[PDB]
Design an enzyme around this catalytic site. Sequence first.
Site, PDB file in Angstrom:
ATOM      1  CG  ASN A 111      -1.752   1.270   1.226  1.00 47.94           C
ATOM      2  OD1 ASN A 111      -2.601   1.508   0.364  1.00 47.94           O
ATOM      3  ND2 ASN A 111      -1.457   2.118   2.206  1.00 47.94           N
ATOM      4  CG  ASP A 188       0.166   6.260  -9.376  1.00 47.81           C
ATOM      5  OD1 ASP A 188      -0.868   5.573  -9.534  1.00 47.81           O
ATOM      6  OD2 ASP A 188       0.436   7.249 -10.103  1.00 47.81           O
ATOM      7  CG  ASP A 217      -0.077  -4.984   5.315  1.00 54.66           C
ATOM      8  OD1 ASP A 217      -0.438  -5.393   6.440  1.00 54.66           O
ATOM      9  OD2 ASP A 217       0.183  -3.789   5.038  1.00 54.66           O
ATOM     10  CD  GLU A 247      -4.554  -6.689   7.317  1.00 56.31           C
ATOM     11  OE1 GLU A 247      -4.872  -6.265   8.451  1.00 56.31           O
ATOM     12  OE2 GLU A 247      -3.677  -6.136   6.631  1.00 56.31           O
TER      13      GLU A 247
END
Length: 462
Positions: A111, A188, A217, A247
């Site tokens: 992320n 991005d 994650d 997750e």
Amino acid sequence: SELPQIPPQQVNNTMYQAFYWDAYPGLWANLPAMAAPLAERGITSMWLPPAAKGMNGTFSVGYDVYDLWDLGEFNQKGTTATRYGTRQQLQQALSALDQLGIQAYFDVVFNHRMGADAQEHIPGFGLAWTEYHLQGRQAHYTQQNWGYLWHDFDWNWTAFNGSDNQLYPGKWWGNTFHFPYLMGEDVDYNRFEVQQEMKAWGEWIINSVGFSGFRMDAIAHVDTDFTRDWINHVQWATSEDVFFVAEAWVSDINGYLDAVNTPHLRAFDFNLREDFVALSSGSKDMRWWGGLVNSQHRDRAVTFVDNHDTSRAGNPYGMPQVINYKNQAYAYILLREHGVPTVFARDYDEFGMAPTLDKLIEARRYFAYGPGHEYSGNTEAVYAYVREGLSTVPGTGLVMLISGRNWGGQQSFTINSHQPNTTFYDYTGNVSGTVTTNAQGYGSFPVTMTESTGWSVWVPQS
């Protein structure tokens, strides 16, 4: 007598989360010895802590990821090794796990990034911590390795959507199932070159480094289309069936899976844990159970009792706790026909549950086969469940009962075991003696009505 011999490709997958918060500095060198008895009990896969270099060096659990291509190989963030060891030690651990028959899953943090090496002035925006040097990328992300997947670009601000809830110029957050911005520099995944680099990285982790799957994650904060396309790419670029678990800590996990729309993706069953919170209270209504494992998506569920977020010193997420009846919760997840269950290291090791969980892991590995059947005679206090076994493997099948109460004594239930004229014994040892079934398969199976020993797993006596 001999254990039931399950055909190798029919053996149940049982996953072990091989860490908890701040646990096991130096894990890689200790992992072979930790894993050897777990393989004997029936663990077949291990979720390893995030293995790439984090911003906080050896003090990082690994979720503040700096360089995905640095597995403890480069001097960055104040250390060469990660908290868990050097890349060489990780490679040694993976080879040992291979020899034990245990697949290793990589905890990938897509992320965001943390720990930029320098500030940049972003034209039209101002200063940001966005210049990332990434020595592992320099060494391993090359055209020589990856052919057309290689692109010549630097990770500066243009590799990121934004930070502190603001978009950088020209950027958008992507199509995310939950809210897009969590922390750090948001990556991005709408940028073609970043997408392609990550495809190469996934091939590297499986085909070069030697992992067998991924735990993804915070993935509901990541662009859904990138998630699908990356999973599909990696799956098709690998000879074996790679395991992927999301997750996706969201309310509508089925909806998340429907949005990503790839058959390869499983998800952690957060909603089932609500029943374990109720169970822990000693007052759960044992008649019914929710969660992804009790839904149409049950074949994509990865079930668990606790993880490093839901069970951590200090309770930082302010989550209802699962304190009591944990063996009962584990029996529930381990003996289910559907879902891949996870044994949590904090429960097994720190909380000392190994001596009882070992019997439940063995029961999943050797007896939990064939169609499962719910019981029409559940009460508010007792839940029961049957695996009919496989006719081609005598000795398989089980009748499980769990108490959600601490009254003392035993209670018995007339249950169709689906095995006529058979003698059963309690594999856990929690109820002594035997149960015999009649010509239709029915027998009267006891359970102890206690928190501390209130689960029984009746299996055929050889």
